[PDB]
Design a protein around this ligand. Structure first.
Ligand SMILES: Cc1cc2nc3c(=O)[nH]c(=O)nc-3n(C[C@H](O)[C@H](O)[C@H](O)COP(=O)(O)OP(=O)(O)OC[C@H]3O[C@@H](n4cnc5c(N)ncnc54)[C@H](O)[C@@H]3O)c2cc1C
Ligand SMILES: NC(=O)C1=CN([C@@H]2O[C@H](COP(=O)(O)OP(=O)(O)OC[C@H]3O[C@@H](n4cnc5c(N)ncnc54)[C@H](OP(=O)(O)O)[C@@H]3O)[C@@H](O)[C@H]2O)C=CC1
Length: 515
């Protein structure tokens, strides 16, 4: 028996464990398939892996001594350094003694008689707990491209999600399929290391410089001396990225003024900075969105000296989402050892023992093929567990059409289960989201223990209520004319207001059962 079982030992699961064990004195065990803490920062060790958030904000805020001890080496933080940070958190707070590593959870079945969860590992070990905390992260299974003959390739074949140690690039012909955030990071990191690089691009996206520079001891001292105000700014913001979130309409200033504002953000770096510190309506007004696109289009044409390559890199969609972030991506395509293939116009039709074949019949001979082709959607990690709630309803069937929840944390028919960084949550920097959710869930569990209530479940109506306010906010946005509602788009501050009103009003929308 435990009071709570936690699935996952990334950012989300580690603070869940700290909060429930040490602040609410509950008996807790966490599980992870990994051999070490860190979650996605343990699993994802591909070349160029880098935070989107600046280093001083991509971390916990709840341990003030840890903040003052923070290593802030560069403006953004690389994967080995995030992993080392989370390892330090687990060291300082004695967390691993209550984490069972190398242990996958195969099933969790709710026992309506006892009002607790029966949790079974992949090695048939059974544990019981009143509450189930699912901290599964935003990514499900690695998505491989479905291409005839991929199994015949005899060279090195790697998905970015399983990047092996000891990979060497010198002298090799390498291909990369995929040009999302991970593909851009990999391509930028390895182009100078390989004999030849072929990029297989299905859809060009916009990318802005990230501006990753070293941090002087003075830069760092200025942050740490003001850290309380910095976090207060996070909690009162929509995105939690430390931005000065603009209200200025894009088309309310002159062309010369507009160019200077975009250039300012371009030089300082960051994708959210470009989209939301410049002007206030780029995600809302079609004309504003096109102006932002055209700024980046002009940059691509200036950086990439061959205009035919520049055209291939230039996105074609009418409206644009938030741009990627890079450390020298477009410059890569000026190199003599880089070839860009548009596989919308010239699709991949076959992989053979030594090559990728495109529809023009060209054999692209490769020593190594890197699939930066992404992951299944967030609800996949839930459906990959055999989770059965009331009446034995499985989460696979409950979410057959997509995920739906209350506040991003509670699922109807699944009592005493609480999601951390689950579907239908806010779009903001993730550590502040996870801290917000862990603290709300722990307060709810604490109120349960005080009031002797043993079953907490959100109602069908509350879920539909949450789905509607997500739909209503999203429909003021361009993001239907671009690439169930997966995200609450009201921002971090309003999300915290939303869940504060629920807890202040006796957990409206939650069925509470007393024993
Ligand atoms: C390179 C990179 C940069 C990023 N930068 C940012 C950024 O700047 N800002 C931002 O907001 N987000 C960013 N993200 C995304 C987000 O911050 C991370 O996904 C975040 O660390 C998620 O933490 P988590 O604990 O919620 O999930 P994860 O770190 O994904 O941890 C989930 C864990 O659950 C375990 N698990 C799952 N199913 C089971 C099971 N059945 N049994 C046992 N264990 C299981 C997994 O093994 C995994 O270890 C970035 C992601 C990457 C890859
Ligand atoms: N640094 C990071 O990696 C971070 C990632 N994230 C999130 O993590 C998730 C994963 O990012 P990423 O790993 O880049 O995965 P993405 O899904 O974002 O991009 C996948 C890439 O592979 C291409 N692709 C997929 N299938 C095929 C195919 N069959 N043939 C050819 N090309 C294909 C896609 O092209 P198309 O566009 O045509 O499908 C796209 O270019 C995203 O949701 C991202 O927002 C968030 C923060 C940081």
């Amino acid at each position: 028996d435990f009071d709570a079982i936690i699935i996952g030992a990334g950012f989300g699961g580690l603070y869940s464990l700290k909060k429930l064990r040490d602040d609410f004195n509950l008996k807790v065990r966490a599980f992870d398939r990994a051999t070490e803490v860190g979650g996605t920062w343990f699993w994802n060790q591909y070349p160029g892996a880098l935070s989107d958030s600046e280093t001083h904000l991509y971390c916990y805020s709840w341990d003030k001594e840890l903040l003052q001890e923070m290593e802030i080496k560069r403006k953004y933080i690389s994967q080995p350094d995030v992993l080392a940070y989370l390892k330090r958190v687990a060291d300082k707070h004695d967390l691993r003694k209550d984490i069972q590593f190398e242990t996958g959870i195969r099933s969790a079945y709710f026992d309506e008689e006892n009002s607790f969860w029966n949790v079974t590992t992949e090695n048939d070990e059974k544990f019981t707990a009143r509450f189930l905390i699912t901290a599964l992260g935003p990514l499900s299974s690695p998505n491989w491209p479905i291409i005839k003959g991929i199994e015949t390739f005899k060279g090195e074949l790697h998905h970015t999600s399983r990047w092996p140690k000891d990979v060497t690039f010198s002298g090799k012909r390498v291909g990369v399929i995929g040009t999302g955030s991970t593909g851009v990071q990999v391509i930028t990191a390895i182009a100078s290391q390989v004999k030849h690089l072929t990029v297989f691009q299905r859809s060009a996206q916009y990318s802005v410089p990230i501006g990753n520079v070293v941090m002087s001891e003075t830069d760092v001292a200025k942050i740490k001396e003001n850290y309380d105000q910095i976090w207060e700014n996070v909690w009162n913001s929509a995105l939690g990225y430390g931005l000065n979130e603009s209200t200025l309409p894009t088309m309310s200033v002159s062309a010369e003024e507009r160019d200077k504002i975009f250039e300012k953000a371009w030089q300082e770096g960051g994708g959210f900075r470009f989209m939301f510190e410049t002007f206030g309506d780029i995600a809302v007004d079609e004309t504003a969105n096109i102006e932002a696109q055209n700024f980046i289009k002009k940059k691509i044409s200036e950086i990439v000296k061959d205009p035919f390559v520049a055209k291939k890199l230039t996105p074609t969609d009418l409206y644009a989402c938030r741009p990627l972030c890079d450390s020298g991506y477009y410059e890569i395509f000026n190199r003599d050892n880089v070839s860009l293939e548009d596989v919308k116009a010239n699709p991949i039709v076959e992989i053979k023992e030594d090559c990728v074949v495109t529809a023009d019949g060209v054999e692209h001979k490769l020593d190594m093929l890197i699939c930066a082709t992404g992951f299944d959607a967030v609800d996949g990690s839930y459906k990959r567990i055999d989770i059965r709630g009331k009446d034995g309803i499985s989460i696979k069937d409950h979410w057959k059409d997509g995920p739906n929840s209350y506040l991003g944390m509670m699922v109807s028919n699944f009592p005493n289960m609480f999601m951390v960084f689950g579907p239908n949550g806010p779009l903001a920097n993730s550590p502040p989201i996870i801290e917000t959710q862990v603290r709300w869930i722990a307060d709810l569990i604490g109120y349960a223990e005080d009031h002797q209530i043993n079953q907490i479940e959100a109602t069908k109506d509350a879920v539909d209520n949450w789905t509607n306010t997500c739909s209503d906010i999203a429909n003021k946005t361009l993001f239907a004319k671009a690439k169930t509602v997966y995200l609450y788009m009201g921002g971090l501050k309003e999300y915290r207001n939303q869940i504060s009103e629920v807890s202040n009003n006796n957990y409206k929308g939650c069925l509470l059962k007393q024993s």
